[PDB]
Amino acid sequence: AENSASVYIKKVEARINEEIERVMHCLDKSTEEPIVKVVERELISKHMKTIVEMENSGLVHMLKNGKTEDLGCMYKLFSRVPNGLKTMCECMSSYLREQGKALVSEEGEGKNPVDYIQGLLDLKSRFDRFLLESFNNDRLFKQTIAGDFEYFLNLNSRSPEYLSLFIDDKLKKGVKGLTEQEVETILDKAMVLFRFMQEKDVFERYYKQHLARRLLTNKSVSDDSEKNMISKLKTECGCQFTSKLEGMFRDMSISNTTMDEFRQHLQATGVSLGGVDLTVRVLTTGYWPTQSATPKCNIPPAPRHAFEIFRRFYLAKHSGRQLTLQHHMGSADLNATTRKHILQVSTFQMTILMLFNNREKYTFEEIQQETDIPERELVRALQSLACGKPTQRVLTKEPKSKEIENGHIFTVNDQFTSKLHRVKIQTVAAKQGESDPERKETRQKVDDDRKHEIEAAIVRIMKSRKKMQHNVLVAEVTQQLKARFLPSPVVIKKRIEGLIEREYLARTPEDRKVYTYVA
């Protein structure tokens, strides 16, 4: 009552020290077991409940401000009395839950995922530093913090997505932390944070999407850190999806071999003035998520000739396969022309600009009637070229408005603000919005991925194992997928009974006594 949790610990430590000194110097030889036991049971066992939680700089406040000496002395004092570390870790976990809920709060739009992941990593590093400095690497504290992280991190389904965005931001360019030591430390911290994370399927899917985004754009991002990333993934994930990652890296390798060989062949042929500079790439459908490779749209004449030459070469010297045309990938360099400044089009504005070159003074009807254009990508490209543009506009209009009309004429502005000859319009890859349609479609995709993965596991494992009666093998199949994602009991229960319609371990429900151990 006369003090608080700040100076009371030093006073009680001094009291214990003087009591033990007196008992060892002024009394008999041993004289200490019952004395120290009863002293502890009176002081610590009574002050433990109230001095760490009530108020006025107890345990939570002395940890929030970052008092290392207070934490160290509390750990060294409460370690003598049993059930002290238990409530210490309980209060620490309660504070961790409160901080996480204050940090993982979803109510409110306009949060930066990279900043959120950076703050979470900073909190984790601060707690680890406090543990190392005060708790002397106690196993109980580490277990409690690991459990607390597992408990509060999986509140929102977008946490692995935000981690993937953060790692993409750190990997795209090492502007912050030019040297390699801090990069290595931050990567180690990131993988440590990912260690206490569930739902690895969405994490891998978004990491692969980020790989596709960063490898199908301007190259020479790091050129060395990919090996470090794959090495860390091997030591963290294993050999489940890392092999496919290096496989799509080999796909990139095959692609660049194709670029150089096609350049050589175009030099050999050199028929039309459409292949001045070709940077074509060749990828496989299985590795990269290019299943939506059918935007059927018109191509500008020089790109038309280039694509025709490439297709003829690929059908002549690479027989046995056919190519598919698409527009939702790649880029281009448009040489405009007082100086000759070269623009940049990401294969979205090429058709509209080519139509403008053929005839100016067009509108929405002109670019929607004689071009065979899709719906959503048309709107996105039109908005990128016209709406929300800074003072470097390359496609202006007379009806200045936010919403898109039908009868609006398109013009072009000089905009000499570009100080170089290579000016690009990077309207794509804007602030991470993660809209509802894309989130829903990727959630459906990952749900189907899990639904096929569980079937693959059950047909790969149960062929060499025993049979189940009611719920025997489901425990094993969930344990094998414990480190992957949630067991989802209802989903697996509904899916295991769908294979009974045909052969290959039909798993008859009525005849569940024995299962068909055949093929």
Place this chain on the structure above:
Amino acid sequence: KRFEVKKWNAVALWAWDIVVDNCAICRNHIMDLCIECQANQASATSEECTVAWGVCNHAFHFHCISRWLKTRQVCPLDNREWEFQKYGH
């Protein structure tokens, strides 16, 4: 002209022998069920039969290729070992 394209950085996609008109295993189609499914609704619960894609870019029904995993699995359209790289067309 006012705007002339200098460089183009397209990406080309390709497949080995998917045969959209026919599953090389079942010879019905790349879509529209398989030999062991027949009726589309029956008792299917959203028709779990999907299209399986391997590292060898060959496409069959997931049911078509699941029956071949028991015996030799060498992707009989080539010598590559069959994998599971994509589900759904």
